[PDB]
């Protein structure tokens, strides 16, 4: 029972958090067109913010 | 779960978490203690 | 001596596998395909035997057949092959096991073309792993066996094989993740950027850098070779399979991870090997203990034998870190004996699976009242597997115990504790193999097992494969001096270098 | 001391010869005797 | 004409582009005069013209590096290699588009005119020393990719994606044009990049602002992590040969523009954008190979795989050694054939069946073995199987990354490749593993196992040539490494 539960659940837990990370990161693509350009302008501003500081 | 207790290995506590948790932490504690004791005992 | 032999032996199944999609019209099940593949494997084993019996000498402790070929003027991919002392019986075991696995694969109907093509593709890689003497081409040959066995276990297996096949290919990718890093780390230290194997052993590194390199080696070699934190892949891999792929699964594929575990982690760096030697010995002890205690409570027929692979590779994990000439020489014999036992046992399990469809130990009560050759072969293979001295398993564990008894720097507590724990490990390891033979055959005649399925007594062809697999184990266990002289000088040089590096 | 090459070169040709002779021997996979394609599934 | 003005003009390193322009004019005149009934010799004539344009670069290879049009165009082995790469992309796009355009319903010559215009723009942007020339060629490629999106004629997905792509491309072009005007204003007034980079060693903040504003419009064309918001919507609604051209030709054009512009403009502030490129590659490989595990559409899976594999090329651009750009030049050459085969198999499966969902892929082992064989042999090369050339590219990439001193980038690349092999093997798992009485509908009635209707034989022999090339480039790549390494030492 220890070999079937404890040492076996870790690989399934890593696969499950990888799957829900992929799900939560593909949920970002909503479909709004100008929100993409807003993200682009935020990245353009944040690049200068990170490079100056 | 269902296909693990069908012969002469049938008991009452098999899938309960409160027993397998303390059994697993006891097994891992003795494994870590044996590894630490063999590391601090050998080459001395 | 001026002719390339190992290169043509590797390249001949890869060339001959192109005739498998050609196949002029058989008008049947695919019998010319297996009749051609058996002849190809037979002439390949004949070429292997003819190359072994003539040019391989037992005097030079280095490499007899040395052939180097400049592939590219780039990075350092160089086709440099070389046969060593402790690697020369491995190729003869590989060819014999693959030839008998090709001969044992008669009832193949659903897609035999891709089956025999992947068989001839894996037979090239199983020699290209052991015959290469590079750092990058070795990783290439290690990743060469990624796709075909995973594809075979995907296209056929037991139930819910899709969950096991993806886990197996992701485990093999996680194994191959660290090999390129650990190969480039030792090569990028200082100068001599070329990837020659003889120059990497003469390099000098720092203490912490050697500890990090040995950790990166041991993580991949603990993922590959099954130890108690990294053996969850092996029941799903070796329980859900058919017999002719399980022969190569339980034979040379498990010894591939143990041969490199010796050759890299002893010859390349022995300074960090002594600091992890008690950890490796204790891990092998815990492996030997845990495999029997896990397999005794299991009800599946194939995982009960798949954990015996862990129980038998724990002896190799003990005998690797013994720092003794006899303990190092017994590990190769233990690997050969374990491969020759496990291939026969899993072929026998896959043969008796077709006669009784249910894989449960409870309903199997009266299968011994009709067929007797099957019960006799199972009893003979089990008694060869447990502790018998006529077979070489007892001789191998005796060599391990004698080499570990006369050791150094483990004087008062460690030898007696590890010996007392391996003694209760060999107490525990025949229990499940005795209980399986007691529960399956020994009992009354079940009426429903005969009413549902009808079993037929075995062929004389099935006697021939077990008769060919059982006689080398008896030949080694009766006279163990046949395998000693093959790698005695190599093991002596290895132990001499390991004792020269180790102080006090 | 016993060598491996003269005891292997005298045992391998009969091993090559017996493979085809036992490959033509069958009888269990011939009439029907089984309901399946050969694999486990 | 005068011999002195023709010698000072140096119009000898422009001949394949003029051959392609003459071919475009002859194709347009044949479409105007004859019409729709002459759709059997025009793409073969365009293939002959592309071959004649790619074959005359061999006298241009053994020539000294001279400038042309008064310091406007520079002709090297790198520009010739990029032009040959773009021509090999365009010829495969024609071979995959010959049946697809006439199955769509539009005229082929009106599409081939814009395709040859984009090919000429890519061949002009493979050099592109001058700043106004960079802007003109980049907007030519941008207008080409605008007009090639809305080709489906009122089908809703392409015209709904084309407006979003037009918005994002116009924003990125305005940002890049503002950065280009800023870079023109930071210098004394010069437009040539050796004349600009001489007087830019002062370390001003406006130089960093102009570098970010130029690299934003550059990384829009490379489609790295902060500007990847257009491609998962673009790649699904656009037609498949259009996106097959845009996945390789525009990407190689953006890579060549980035390499040449950053080399000829900023040999002083390299460590400022090296950390930015490490951040971009680290985010891009992770985001691609984590997002692409959950998608259920095959075209969107290849779209996110493009973003996941575009980050591996940035590891060769992070480093400053001479063996770093050779890894990118080899990986783009392998990725051209890999994406060509992976697009040809999807085009065949979508033209013979219709829709191309993942779960519909079951039952391909019995109907057509050649199509699933080519798709498996191409996706295994895309995954990194060591008999194939993608592993031979990735080993050289990781070797350059571990030699120059980038340990974490190679470690994250290996981790993302190990993660990505699970969804790289999923299409093969749907194809060659699924048993009978398990496949979905519209597979059991495959009527056209033989190809004899309206030029399916060039589409078949292109996939055969792609499979043979990606099978022979893995074990035999000895002149390819020399041809890559002989065009990398010229970059300072
Ligand atoms: C210590 C060194 C370790 C080295 C190895 C790790 C190197 C890094 C590996 C990279 C991580 C991979 C992430 C992606 C995983 C994923 O996609 O899973 C998707 C699949 C699908 O799941 C299954 O899929 C089935 C459907 S199907 O098969 O996919 O079709 C479905 O039926 C089922 O429900 C579902 O479970 O999951 C699995 O098959 C489980 C295996 C996942 C392998 C992850 C390896 C990580 C191991 C961590 C180390 C363990 C240490 C143990 C000791 C403490
Ligand atoms: C170096 C050490 C080597 C150790 C080797 C260990 C081998 C252990 C084998 C154990 C087999 C157990 C089977 C028990 C009997 C059974 O049920 O099957 C009975 C069937 C007979 O079939 C059938 O038997 C029926 C009789 S009955 O059913 O048993 O009543 C009969 O009716 C029918 O006609 C017939 O078809 O099997 C046979 O008896 C075949 C002979 C097997 C016995 C092996 C003899 C051991 C010789 C040792 C040689 C040493 C080699 C030294 C090398 C240098
Ligand atoms: C070096 C090799 C390493 C292993 C890599 C191989 C990966 C496995 C191949 C992919 C699956 C292909 C299925 C295709 C489907 C196909 O086209 O054939 C389908 C064909 C159908 O035959 P069957 O009789 O099985 O048909 C099904 C019938 O039974 C009806 O039920 O099967 C074969 O003949 C297999 C032939 C091998 C085909 C694979 C050849 C690959 C050649 C290249 C190998 C690599 C060379 C590398 C450079 C040296
Ligand atoms: C209680 C304990 C009892 C233990 C007794 C066990 C003894 C075992 C020892 C074996 C080592 C033998 C070495 C001697 C051998 C030896 O010294 O002579 C070796 C000798 C070689 O001859 P020459 O040296 O003249 O040859 C020179 C040429 O070979 C050069 O090419 O001849 C052999 O090759 C014999 C042929 C092999 C014969 C194999 C016999 C076994 C065959 C079994 C076949 C299977 C039977 C299956 C039945 C189903
Ligand atoms: C409506 C159709 C429009 C189709 C395009 C028209 C093509 C007509 C002229 C061919 C251009 C190539 C001439 C090279 C062919 C060639 O090598 O000729 C030879 C000579 C160049 O010779 P070099 O001085 O390089 O000498 C090479 C020798 O030294 C080696 O033996 O070219 C001329 O005489 C230049 C004057 C041509 C007239 C001006 C043409 C240049 C402007 C054309 C527009 C250029 C931009 C076009 C792309 C946008
Ligand atoms: C580095 C690698 C480069 C490789 C590139 C490949 C180069 C070679 C490719 C040739 C294959 C193409 C022809 C095969 C096609 C073929 O064999 O099939 C014949 C082809 C198809 O005809 P159908 O059979 O459809 O004919 C109508 C039927 O319905 C009646 O049977 O018809 C042609 O004649 C097309 C016209 C080709 C015209 C060729 C060009 C004319 C000369 C142009 C001179 C150009 C000067 C330069 C431009 C200014
Ligand atoms: C010229 C410089 C550039 C050359 C580059 C080469 C490009 C590749 C070759 C394409 C030329 C055109 C072939 C069209 C083919 C053509 O048009 O059809 C020729 C013919 C098919 O048509 P048939 O003449 O049978 O059809 C008559 C009809 O009327 C019946 O419906 O042969 C085929 O079965 C071809 C099979 C594909 C075979 C592809 C092989 C390609 C060569 C591969 C060499 C491999 C070496 C492997 C070494 C291991
Ligand atoms: C190939 C190989 C090898 C080999 C070698 C050798 C050395 C051989 C042989 C040897 C020898 C020199 C042996 C022989 C002898 C013995 C014998 C001859 C035995 C007997 C047995 C029998 C015959 C029986 C049978 C049976 C039984 C017992 C019962 C049940 C049933 C059966 C059938 C199982 C090696 C190792 C390298 C490893 C690798 C592989
Ligand atoms: C037009 C036509 C042809 C003519 C087409 C032939 C000439 C084949 C044309 C193939 C071209 C020449 C392949 C070009 C090869 C490229 C050099 C490949 C490079 C690109 C790779 C990277 C893919 C036929 O042979 C035919 C046969 C049977 C039925 C119908 C037809 C048919 O309609």
Swiss-Prot record, chain C:
Biological process terms in GO annotation: ATP synthesis coupled electron transport; electron transport coupled proton transport
Reactions mediated catalytically: a plastoquinone + NADH + (n+1) H(+)(in) = a plastoquinol + NAD(+) + n H(+)(out); a plastoquinone + NADPH + (n+1) H(+)(in) = a plastoquinol + NADP(+) + n H(+)(out)
Keyword Thylakoid set for record: yes
Main location: membrane
Localization (cell): Cellular thylakoid membrane
EC number of the protein: 7.1.1.-
Keywords associated with the record: Membrane, NAD, NADP, Plastoquinone, Quinone, Thylakoid, Translocase, Transmembrane, Transmembrane helix
Highest taxon in the source lineage: Bacteria
Transmembrane segments: 3-23, 35-55, 90-110, 114-134, 136-156, 168-188, 208-228, 242-262, 276-296, 313-333, 334-354, 386-406, 416-436
Protein's name according to its UniProt entry: NAD(P)H-quinone oxidoreductase chain 4 1
Gene that this sequence comes from: ndhD1
UniProtKB/Swiss-Prot annotation, chain E:
Catalytically driven reaction(s): a plastoquinone + NADH + (n+1) H(+)(in) = a plastoquinol + NAD(+) + n H(+)(out); a plastoquinone + NADPH + (n+1) H(+)(in) = a plastoquinol + NADP(+) + n H(+)(out)
BP-aspect Gene Ontology terms: ATP synthesis coupled electron transport; photosynthesis, light reaction
Highest taxon in the source lineage: Bacteria
Membrane topology: Multi-pass membrane protein
Enzyme class (EC, first level): translocase
Key words of the record: Membrane, NAD, NADP, Plastoquinone, Quinone, Thylakoid, Translocase, Transmembrane, Transmembrane helix, Transport
One Gene Ontology term, aspect cellular component: plasma membrane-derived thylakoid membrane
Annotated EC: 7.1.1.-
Cellular location(s): Cellular thylakoid membrane
An annotated Gene Ontology molecular function: NADH dehydrogenase (ubiquinone) activity
Transmembrane segments: 13-33, 41-61, 78-98, 108-127, 131-150, 166-186, 205-225, 239-259, 273-293, 301-321, 329-349, 373-393, 395-415, 461-481
Family statement: Belongs to the complex I subunit 2 family.
NCBIfam families: NDH_I_N, PRK02504.1
PANTHER family per the UniProt record, alphabetical: NADH DEHYDROGENASE
Role this protein plays: NDH-1 shuttles electrons from an unknown electron donor, via FMN and iron-sulfur (Fe-S) centers, to quinones in the respiratory and/or the photosynthetic chain. The immediate electron acceptor for the enzyme in this species is believed to be plastoquinone. Couples the redox reaction to proton translocation, and thus conserves the redox energy in a proton gradient. Cyanobacterial NDH-1 also plays a role in inorganic carbon-concentration.
Quaternary state and interactors: NDH-1 can be composed of about 15 different subunits; different subcomplexes with different compositions have been identified which probably have different functions.
Protein name as catalogued: NAD(P)H-quinone oxidoreductase subunit 2
Organism: Thermosynechococcus vestitus (strain NIES-2133 / IAM M-273 / BP-1)
């Amino acid at each position: 029972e220890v070999d079937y539960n404890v040492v076996d659940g870790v690989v399934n837990l890593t696969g499950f958090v990888t799957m829900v990370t992929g799900e939560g990161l593909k949920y970002l693509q909503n479909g709004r067109a100008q929100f993409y350009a807003l993200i682009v302008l935020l990245a353009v501003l944040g690049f200068v913010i990170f490079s100056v500081q | 779960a269902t296909d693990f207790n069908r012969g002469i290995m049938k008991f009452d506590g098999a899938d309960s978490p409160a027993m397998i948790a303390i059994s697993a932490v006891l097994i891992l504690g003795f494994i870590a203690g044996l590894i630490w004791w063999a590391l601090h005992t050998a080459y001395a | 001596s001026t002719f390339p032999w190992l290169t043509t032996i590797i390249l001949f199944p890869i060339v001959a596998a192109l005739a498998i999609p050609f196949i002029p019209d058989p008008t049947g099940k695919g019998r010319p395909i297996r009749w051609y593949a058996l002849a190809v494997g037979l002439i390949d084993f004949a070429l292997i035997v003819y190359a072994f019996t003539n040019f391989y000498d037992l005097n030079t402790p280095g490499m007899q057949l040395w052939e180097s070929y400049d592939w590219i003027p780039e990075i350092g991919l160089r086709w440099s092959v070389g046969a060593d002392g402790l690697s020369m019986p491995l190729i003869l075991l590989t060819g014999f096991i693959t030839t008998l696995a090709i001969l044992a694969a008669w009832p193949v109907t659903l897609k035999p073309r891709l089956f025999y093509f992947l068989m001839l593709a894996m037979y090239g890689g199983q020699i290209a792993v052991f015959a290469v003497q590079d750092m990058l081409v070795f990783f290439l040959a290690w990743e060469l066996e990624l796709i075909p066995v995973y594809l075979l276990l995907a296209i056929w297996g037991g139930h819910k094989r899709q969950y096991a096949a993806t886990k197996f290919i992701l485990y093999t990718a996680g194994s191959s993740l660290f090999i390129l890093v650990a190969g480039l780390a030792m090569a990028f230290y200082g100068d001599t950027v070329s990837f020659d194997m003889q120059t990497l052993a003469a390099k000098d590194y720092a203490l912490g850098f050697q500890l990090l390199v040995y950790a990166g080696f041991l993580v991949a070699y603990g993922v590959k070779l099954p130890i108690v934190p990294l053996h969850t892949w092996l029941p799903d891999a070796h329980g859900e399979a058919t017999a002719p792929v399980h022969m190569l699964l339980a034979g040379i594929l498990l010894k591939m991870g143990g041969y490199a575990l010796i050759r890299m982690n002893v010859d390349m760096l022995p300074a960090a090997h002594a600091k992890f030697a008690p950890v490796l010995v204790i891990l092998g002890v815990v492996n030997i203990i845990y495999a029997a205690l896990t397999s005794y409570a299991q009800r599946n027929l194939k995982r009960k034998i798949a954990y015996s692979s862990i129980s038998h590779i724990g002896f190799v994990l003990i005998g690797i870190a013994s720092f003794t000439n006899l303990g190092m020489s017994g590990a190769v014999l233990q690997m050969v004996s374990h491969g020759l036992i496990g291939a026969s046992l899993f072929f026998l399990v896959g043969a008796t699976y077709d006669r009784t469809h249910t894989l449960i130990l409870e309903e199997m009560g009266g299968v011994g009242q009709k067929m007797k050759k099957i019960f006799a072969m199972f009893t003979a293979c089990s008694l060869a597997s447990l502790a018998l001295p006529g077979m070489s398993g007892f001789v191998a564990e005796l060599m391990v115990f004698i080499g570990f008894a006369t050791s150094d720097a483990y004087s008062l507590p460690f030898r007696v504790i590890v010996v007392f724990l391996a003694a209760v490990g060999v107490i525990l390891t025949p229990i499940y193999l005795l209980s399986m033979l007691r529960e399956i055959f020994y009992g009354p005649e079940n009426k429903e097992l005969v009413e549902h399925e009808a079993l037929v007594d075995a062929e004389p062809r099935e006697v021939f494969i077990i008769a060919c697999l059982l006689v080398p184990i008896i030949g080694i266990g009766l006279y163990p001096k046949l395998l000693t002289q093959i790698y005695d000088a190599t093991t002596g040089q290895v132990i001499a270098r390991a004792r020269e590096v180790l102080p006090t | 001391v016993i060598s491996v090459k003269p005891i292997l070169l005298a045992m391998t040709p009969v091993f090559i010869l017996l493979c085809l002779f036992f490959g033509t021997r069958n009888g269990f996979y011939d009439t029907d005797q089984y309901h399946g394609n050969g694999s486990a599934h | 004409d005068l011999v002195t003005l023709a010698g000072q003009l140096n119009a000898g390193t422009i001949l394949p582009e003029t051959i392609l322009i003459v071919t475009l004019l002859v194709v347009l005149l044949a479409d105007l005069i004859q019409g729709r009934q002459a759709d059997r010799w025009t793409p073969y004539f365009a293939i002959v013209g592309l071959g004649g344009a790619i074959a005359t670069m061999i006298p241009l290879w053994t020539q000294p590096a001279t400038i042309s049009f008064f310091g406007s165009f520079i002709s090297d082995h790198l520009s010739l290699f990029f032009r040959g790469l773009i021509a090999l992309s365009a010829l495969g796009t024609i071979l995959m588009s010959i049946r697809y355009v006439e199955q769509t319903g539009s005229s082929l010559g009106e599409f081939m005119t814009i395709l040859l215009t984009a090919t000429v723009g890519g061949m002009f942007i493979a050099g592109a020393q001058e700043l106004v020339f960079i802007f003109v060629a980049l907007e030519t490629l941008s207008i080409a990719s605008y007009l090639l999106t809305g080709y489906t004629k009122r089908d809703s997905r392409s015209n709904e994606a084309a407006l979003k792509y037009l918005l994002i491309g116009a924003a990125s072009s305005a940002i890049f044009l503002y950065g280009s005007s800023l870079l023109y204003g930071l210098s004394g007034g010069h437009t040539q990049l050796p004349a600009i980079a001489q007087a830019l060693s002062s370390e001003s903040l406006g130089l960093v602002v102009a570098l970010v504003f130029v690299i934003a419009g550059i990384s829009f064309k490379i489609s790295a992590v902060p500007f990847h918001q257009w491609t998962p919507d673009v790649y699904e609604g656009a037609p498949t040969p259009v996106v097959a051209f845009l996945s390789v030709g525009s990407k190689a054009a953006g890579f060549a523009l980035a390499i040449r512009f950053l080399t000829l403009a900023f040999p002083s502030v390299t460590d400022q954008w090296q950390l930015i490129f490490t951040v971009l590659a680290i985010l891009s490989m992770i985001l691609g190979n984590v997002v692409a595990l959950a998608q259920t559409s095959m075209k969107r899976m290849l779209a996110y795989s493009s973003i996941g594999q575009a980050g591996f090329v940035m590891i060769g651009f992070v480093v400053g050694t001479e063996a770093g750009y050779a890894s990118m030049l080899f990986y783009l050459l392998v990725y051209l054939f890999m994406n060509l085969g992976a697009f040809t198999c999807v085009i065949l499966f979508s033209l013979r069946t219709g829709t191309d969902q993942i779960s519909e892929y079951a039952g391909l082992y019995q109907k057509d073995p050649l199509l699933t064989l080519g798709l498996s042999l191409c996706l295994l090369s895309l995954g990194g199987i060591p008999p194939l050339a993608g592993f031979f590219g990735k080993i050289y990439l990781f070797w350059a990354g571990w030699q120059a001193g980038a340990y974490g980038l190679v470690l994250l690349g290996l981790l993302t490749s190990v993660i990505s092999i699970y969804y790289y093997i999923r299409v093969v798992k749907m194809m060659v593993v699924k048993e009978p009485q398990e496949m979905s509908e519209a597979v059991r009635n495959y009527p056209e196992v033989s190809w004899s209707s309206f030029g399916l034989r060039p589409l078949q022999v292109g996939l055969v040539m792609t499979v043979i090339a990606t099978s022979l480039a893995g074990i035999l790549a000895n002149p390819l490494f020399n041809l890559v390494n002989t065009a990398v030492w010229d970059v300072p």
